[PDB]
Amino acid sequence: YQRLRHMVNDKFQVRSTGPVNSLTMQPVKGRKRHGGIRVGEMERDALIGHGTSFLLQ
Amino acid sequence: MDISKPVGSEITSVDFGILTAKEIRNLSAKQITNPTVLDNLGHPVSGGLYDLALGAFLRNLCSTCGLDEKFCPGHQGHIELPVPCYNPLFFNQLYIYLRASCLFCHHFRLKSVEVHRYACKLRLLQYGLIDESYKLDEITLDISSTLLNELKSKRSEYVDMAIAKALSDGRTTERGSFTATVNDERKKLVHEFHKKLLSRGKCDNCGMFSPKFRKDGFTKIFETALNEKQITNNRVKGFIRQDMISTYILSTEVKNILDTVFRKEQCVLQYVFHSRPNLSRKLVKADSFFMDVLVVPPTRFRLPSKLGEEVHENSQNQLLSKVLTTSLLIRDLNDDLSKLKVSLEDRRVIFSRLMNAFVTIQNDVNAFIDSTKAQGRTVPIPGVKQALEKKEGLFRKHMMGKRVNYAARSVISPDPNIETNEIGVPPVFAVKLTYPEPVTAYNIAELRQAVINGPDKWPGATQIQNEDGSLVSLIGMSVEQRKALANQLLTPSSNVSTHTLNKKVYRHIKNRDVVLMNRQPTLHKASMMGHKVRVLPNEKTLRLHYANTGAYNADFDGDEMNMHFPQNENARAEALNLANTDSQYLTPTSGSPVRGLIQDHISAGVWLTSKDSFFTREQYQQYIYGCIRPEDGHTTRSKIVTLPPTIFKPYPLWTGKQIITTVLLNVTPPDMPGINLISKNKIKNEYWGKGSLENEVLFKDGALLCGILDKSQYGASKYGIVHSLHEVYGPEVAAKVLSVLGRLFTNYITATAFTCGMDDLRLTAEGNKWRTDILKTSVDTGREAAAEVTNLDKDTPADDPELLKRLQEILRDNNKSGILDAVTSSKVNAITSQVVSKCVPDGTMKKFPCNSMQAMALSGAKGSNVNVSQIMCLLGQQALEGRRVPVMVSGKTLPSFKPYETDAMAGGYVKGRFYSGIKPQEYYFHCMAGREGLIDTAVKTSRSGYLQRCLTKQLEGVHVSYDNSIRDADGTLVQFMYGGDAIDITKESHMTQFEFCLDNYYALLKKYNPSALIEHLDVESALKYSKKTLKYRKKHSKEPHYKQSVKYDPVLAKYNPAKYLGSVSENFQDKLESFLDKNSKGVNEKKFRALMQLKYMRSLINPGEAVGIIASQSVGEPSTQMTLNTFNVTLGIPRLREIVMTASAAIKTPQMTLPIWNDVSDEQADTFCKSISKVLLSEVIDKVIVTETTGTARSYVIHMRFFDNNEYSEEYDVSKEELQNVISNQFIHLLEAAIVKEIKKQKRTTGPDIGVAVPRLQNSKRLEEDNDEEQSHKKTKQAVSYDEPDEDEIETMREAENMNKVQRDRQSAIISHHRFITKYNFDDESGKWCEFKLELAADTEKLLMVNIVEEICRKSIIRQIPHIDRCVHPEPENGKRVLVTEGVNFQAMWDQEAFIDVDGITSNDVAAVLKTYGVEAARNTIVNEINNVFSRYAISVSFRHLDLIADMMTRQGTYLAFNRQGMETSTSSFMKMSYETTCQFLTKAVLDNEREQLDSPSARIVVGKLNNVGTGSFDVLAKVPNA
Amino acid sequence: IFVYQNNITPSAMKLVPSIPPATIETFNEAALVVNITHHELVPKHIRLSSDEKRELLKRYRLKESQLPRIQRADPVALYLGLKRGEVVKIIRKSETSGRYASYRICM
Ligand SMILES: [Zn+2]
Ligand SMILES: [Zn+2]
């Protein structure tokens, strides 16, 4: 057996309330910077899909 | 968001307009005049971009609101432009109005009566009345002014009357009615108006010509001088003026021209610029297109970017400083201009100084707004247009999608010990993710502990919010302070201003919380479900159960998942009751399951439920409690009930099947009876020995009495045990059964393991003998097939010289090699099938159930009988791109094989298996075929990302209304009923499973409780009507669809399905009645009818359901499975793109399906095929001999040697007479034109230019990245949207909207019609040749006549029916005798009534069908064609989705596609702005003076309003008792 | 109804909507060779009375334009001789519900 060099849990992150960009006032990008997880157009579409308006809000 | 902080005011609508200079000057906090931003020392300079009046900056307080950097919102300022500038966004429009106006009378050059006609039509369109706008054109009486003014009066009279009449009724409000069709009619007119405006040259009012205005890329206009004809026109029309009383043009001159024109033509422009009536009564002024000032955004939005230590200057301040420098310079130029003047004459310099001053400030203004409109500087600084469209745009990157708080990301790890509806949360996330829990009397105990525990001990609390609004962090505090604060949580509020409020505790995520689990790409809503939090100690990864693997399309290969923690109870309720996992058992795509156990559990079940599996009392009870724990709420009886043993004497023993009976007996409700189901298995009875019935799955009163349980029962498979349980007991019970079975099989696999080894791969000595004997016949097959394709009798030897010459002919042709490959492959594959059928399983040493390799393939746990046969028998023929192994120019498939070898092995046929090993030749051939697949995965530009993105943006608003109809976001009706029956796809499964429903009558009667409904519905109205429709339907059964009765329409059209029992689809009615007739079986046939009627009632789609998104997701998500290439017509994603994305009128493969009669024979139909198929001269010619002889004149003797007369007449249906006409009329005229062109081309360019350069013949690390290197980047990136169209889609978007006497007379007549021929003799008797002599001049010299003739022959058409290339006769499709055409022309086929049934002539071309047969026919073509794309890849998509998509494409009565063009006719400008060309759609919105009603999902997201779909489709009001 | 053979003069075509309330409809005999409403893909289109339209706009609380559209120059619209405002009832066979009544407004 061979052990592959990669440590897959390198992008492991958690954010409650971290820093925000001045213009958008939205969670700033950066795992190590206590950054936010992006909810993109597809996730927006999925939340519209369930008809789950408060989850989208 | 704080529930303690409610909001009383709300934005209902957004109005688009232009800021006036007077307006900006008043609201401005400070006038910006200085280009410097900082004084010396470091303080902001007064009158600069960092002035403190624009807000708090550099630890200084704001000089307007007095607040610091935190609380100061920032304030707007202004720059005073020394000269007016053209606003870049509205330059194109002001340009249109400048070119359209007269420079003398200062009216538009179009006649006033024609202008008034547009003003009238546009006024009537402000209100929703299109019919009246067209009826205005009917009002009709070089024409006198007294007559034309009466026409304007009569037209105005009709306009005022039509508005008042419609205003009296509920046809239009005072604010005016506005629909997409109304918008379409407005957009058409405003376009036609500007087109007519620009077309006029000479002014129709005063006959004087105006000088034409030209433009460049940048905002700058020039005036082209008039011609002498137009200058003399000004002179003669100069006297009539008295009785009534290229050069650059400055911005002021243009503004002054438009100022008077906008005053004089105010009446039409009032309706040209207002979408709805102008109730504000504002004047339409020209200065809206001009900028006399520039607003300076607050310092807050222009802060200098800080990256580590370096503080970088803001790019907007840089662009603004440039505008300030130029403004100070023009102020000096105007000051020097003011000084001096008596001395002038040379005024060419003062205008030159002015032109520079104007073009410089304009450029600085342009550079600030839109950089791609400014001059090149020696990458430029981005403008405000560029800021809104940086990449995807501000709307897409920061409005439609956003980075969120209270969310986590981690690699997922499998876990069978957690519930199927749960998520294993690492304690790392549990101590950081908190919920704002308000402290009350019922939860004071729970939260006091959390407060004491603090932010590092779970379940704790990170913070506490007091009723005054302040926050108290528990992070730095010790156990002593936390204990004190906990005893202060329920203290009464002293302040009367906050007595209403109560404290909040920001408590750690507990095991009772909801979380949103997401696995990207989120192709369908099942990839974003609600999971129950289960904090697992000593964990560093997110734990997920195997039942969730399908829906997320997540494999535990190092995948990543996003966890979202919603922060309010409304969001909680939604994630627990709507988006929760258990409510996502069935996908809305086909209504089939996406939840079930995957591998070990399937193999465990086949062993556990086997007859041989027996268990003692101790063993049996252990397996029960092992998976069912009453303390975890798994039971329904509060005591574990147990069945008696199946064996009493000698020893008490329980069967394996009894464990399955006991699990159901403890998880299903006691009040309801047991499940009754007769299903089947994947494992055939033959495997279980003689006379076994172990394939028949039998459940009688919730007891497994016969058959084992496969992937077909507790996997994600329709009509299995779990699905049957789901229909009878609900989704919560089915979820419990899945988790219970999941535990049982995990525990069973721990006590009784499952393994795979070499013993499972071996054949017996008998079985291996069969293998060698069948494969011994395969050696002959190679040469046999080679002798068949080559056409050689008695089967010639492998080394035959004639055969080897014949195989060479095959080698050089791609088609000939294809015939050889397909024949040899079919023959060797027949030998493969024989080996496999004999050896597996009757020849395997170890046999099922013990042969685990065999077991896994049969159970559906993993693998198939094909994989099993490659392992134990042979790999077979290695197929490469539909053919065999590639062959070299030498005729060798490898250097080891003989040239033109007639052997199966040489062609790639592998006799070897993976157990015994594969030979080096076979190894290399396997390497070829193995790689071939991975190459296809590398070269596959087709993506479902953009296709789904286009559908979802146009269908987002489309949902189910409370009146059961399918309505868009703006209330416009799309469908009158969902799929014409209003059924939810996630319910339409057992609705036709009548026998199932009958066997479970009392179980379902208890489920669909009618006792609490009988008082709310009607039991006869619809049932009586259903009989009346059935009566008239049976009367016209044999009659055609056009002759059918229209007296009574369907029962669903007249009676609400949720209020009237019996208002069911005629499809359901016919199916239900047919069951009661064909099956005569204490349930009556009348009481069963009522139950099924009630089942349909309870299967209705809920009002609010986003059927739009669901439809696009149901077309998008499965279109990912058809990314692979063809194994003629366009298939997969390219064909789907031709329909949905581009709605092409020019299809790649246009076809026509012609249904042939019964009286027309197979020979007659083939003769008919030839009669329509396009025939070329090339197709009938065998040889052309050109005898170039130069004498006296270049003589060219062209002899056309055709095939025999009877040969081409039987192959193309072409006569000798037909050939004569084409050569004598077309071919010679085409040949003469080609020779003349070749003589000119010879004398034009003598040769290529020597020394002069000619044109050349023809991310880097990313393209060299392997799949493990490329998927790792996708593994970490959280996608902005739906992939990218940068492939073929971008290039598709690159399209903007001795001779006889009779023979002598014939020759002489042809000589008079052709300039170069001398002789013309054609075979009239036999019809085999055509000879003609061509005479050329002595100066024409050398020419390549053969090559010239050749090219014209394949260009000459003998016979062709317009737009049709070839008509073929395929195999009868589903019993229907049809002919497939490679072209479309209905009117031509209409004349072939003797052969074709003109009422059944199908066509794939939607646009062609629309043009001839109408919108409803095109609509039916869309639903059929999209279905053909999915049915080919064996993908089932509900017609309810396709019908909705088709209805949306045909909403305008035309064929609209899901793209920028189709979208143009949509109410929401915000939806349009968030799709593409944000500034362009915004400009169109402002110019229309549009009101965004905020009714589209996109618009609501933009303004932070709750979406109107689902939970937002109503309002919640509280009932209060006191008066 | 005026059934022409090959073509009509552009000057003559202007005389068609010149005499209201009388309406003139032109048809090419080559285009009338086969009836389009007889085709399997063309459902039964029925023109509704001013009262039937009035009732439909009430049941669904619709505005004329808020309905699915049929072009005035659509082959079936030209067949039944539809005028702008006239609502047409379409009885279409579905492979999910069977007979289904849908509607379209001619604009
Ligand atoms: Zn301020
Ligand atoms: Zn004029």
UniProtKB/Swiss-Prot annotation, chain A:
Segments passing through the bilayer: none
Localization per record: Nucleus, Nucleolus
Disulfide bonds: none
Coiled-coil ranges from the UniProt annotation: none
Role of this protein: DNA-dependent RNA polymerases catalyze the transcription of DNA into RNA using the four ribonucleoside triphosphates as substrates. Component of RNA polymerase I (Pol I) which synthesizes ribosomal RNA precursors. Besides, RNA polymerase I has intrinsic RNA cleavage activity. RPA190 and RPA135 both contribute to the polymerase catalytic activity and together form the Pol I active center. In addition, subunit RPA12 contributes a catalytic zinc ribbon that is required for RNA cleavage by Pol I.
Subunit structure: Component of the RNA polymerase I (Pol I) complex consisting of 14 subunits: RPA135, RPA190, RPC40, RPA14, RPB5, RPO26, RPA43, RPB8, RPA12, RPB10, RPC19, RPC10, RPA49 and RPA34. The complex is composed of a horseshoe-shaped core containing ten subunits (RPA135, RPA190, RPB5, RPO26, RPB8, RPB10, RPC10, RPA12, RPC19 and RPC40) where RPA135 and RPA190 form the DNA-binding cleft. Outside of the core, RPA14 and RPA43 form the stalk that mediates interactions with transcription initiation factors and newly synthesized RNA.
Additional observations: Three distinct zinc-containing RNA polymerases are found in eukaryotic nuclei: polymerase I for the ribosomal RNA precursor, polymerase II for the mRNA precursor, and polymerase III for 5S and tRNA genes.
UniProt record similarity statement: Belongs to the RNA polymerase beta chain family.
Protein name as it appears in the record: DNA-directed RNA polymerase I subunit RPA135
Organism: Saccharomyces cerevisiae (strain ATCC 204508 / S288c) (Baker's yeast)
Taxonomic lineage: Eukaryota, Fungi, Dikarya, Ascomycota, Saccharomycotina
Segment of the intact protein contained: 1033 to 1089 of 1203
UniProtKB/Swiss-Prot annotation, chain B:
Location of this chain's protein in the cell: Nucleus, Nucleolus
Gene3D superfamilies: 1.10.132.30, 1.10.150.390, 1.10.357.120, 2.40.40.20, 3.30.70.2850, RNA polymerase ii, RNA polymerase II, clamp domain, RNA polymerase Rpb1, domain 3
GO CC terms: mitochondrion; nucleolus; nucleus; RNA polymerase I complex
Catalyzed chemical reaction(s): RNA(n) + a ribonucleoside 5'-triphosphate = RNA(n+1) + diphosphate
Binding site for Zn(2+) 2: C102, C105, C203, C206
Residues bound to Zn(2+) 1: C62, C65, C72, H75
Binding site for Mg(2+): D555, D557, D559
Domain of life: Eukaryota
Region feature (Disordered): 1249-1297
Top EC group: transferase
InterPro entries linked to this entry: DNA-dir_RNA_pol1_lsu_C, DNA-dir_RNA_pol1_lsu_N, DNA-dir_RpoC_beta_prime, RNA_pol_asu, RNA_pol_N, RNA_pol_Rpb1_1, RNA_pol_Rpb1_3, RNA_pol_Rpb1_3_sf
GO MF assignments: DNA binding; DNA-directed RNA polymerase activity; metal ion binding; promoter-specific chromatin binding
Annotated keywords: DNA-directed RNA polymerase, Magnesium, Metal-binding, Nucleotidyltransferase, Nucleus, Phosphoprotein, Ribosome biogenesis, Transcription, Transferase, Zinc
Record-annotated membrane-spanning stretches: none
Segments for region (Bridging helix): 920-932
EC assignment: 2.7.7.6
One of the Pfam families matching this protein, by short name: RNA_pol_Rpb1_1
PANTHER family (alphabetical): DNA-DIRECTED RNA POLYMERASE, DNA-DIRECTED RNA POLYMERASE I SUBUNIT RPA1
Family, per entry: Belongs to the RNA polymerase beta' chain family.
Role of this protein: DNA-dependent RNA polymerases catalyze the transcription of DNA into RNA using the four ribonucleoside triphosphates as substrates. Component of RNA polymerase I (Pol I) which synthesizes ribosomal RNA precursors. Besides, RNA polymerase I has intrinsic RNA cleavage activity. RPA190 and RPA135 both contribute to the polymerase catalytic activity and together form the Pol I active center. In addition, subunit RPA12 contributes a catalytic zinc ribbon that is required for RNA cleavage by Pol I.
Note: Present with 2840 molecules/cell in log phase SD medium.
Protein name as it appears in the record: DNA-directed RNA polymerase I subunit RPA190
Taxonomic path: Eukaryota, Fungi, Dikarya, Ascomycota, Saccharomycotina
From Swiss-Prot, chain C:
Domain of life, source organism: Eukaryota
Subcellular location: Nucleus
Oligomeric form and interacting partners: Component of the RNA polymerase I (Pol I), RNA polymerase II (Pol II) and RNA polymerase III (Pol III) complexes. Component of the RNA polymerase I (Pol I) complex consisting of 14 subunits: RPA135, RPA190, RPC40, RPA14, RPB5, RPO26, RPA43, RPB8, RPA12, RPB10, RPC19, RPC10, RPA49 and RPA34. The complex is composed of a horseshoe-shaped core containing ten subunits (RPA135, RPA190, RPB5, RPO26, RPB8, RPB10, RPC10, RPA12, RPC19 and RPC40) where RPA135 and RPA190 form the DNA-binding cleft.
Record function comment: DNA-dependent RNA polymerases catalyze the transcription of DNA into RNA using the four ribonucleoside triphosphates as substrates. Common component of RNA polymerases I, II and III which synthesize ribosomal RNA precursors, mRNA precursors and many functional non-coding RNAs, and small RNAs, such as 5S rRNA and tRNAs, respectively. Pol II is the central component of the basal RNA polymerase II transcription machinery. RNA polymerase complexes are composed of mobile elements that move relative to each other.
Family: Belongs to the archaeal Rpo5/eukaryotic RPB5 RNA polymerase subunit family.
Name the UniProt record assigns to this protein: DNA-directed RNA polymerases I, II, and III subunit RPABC1
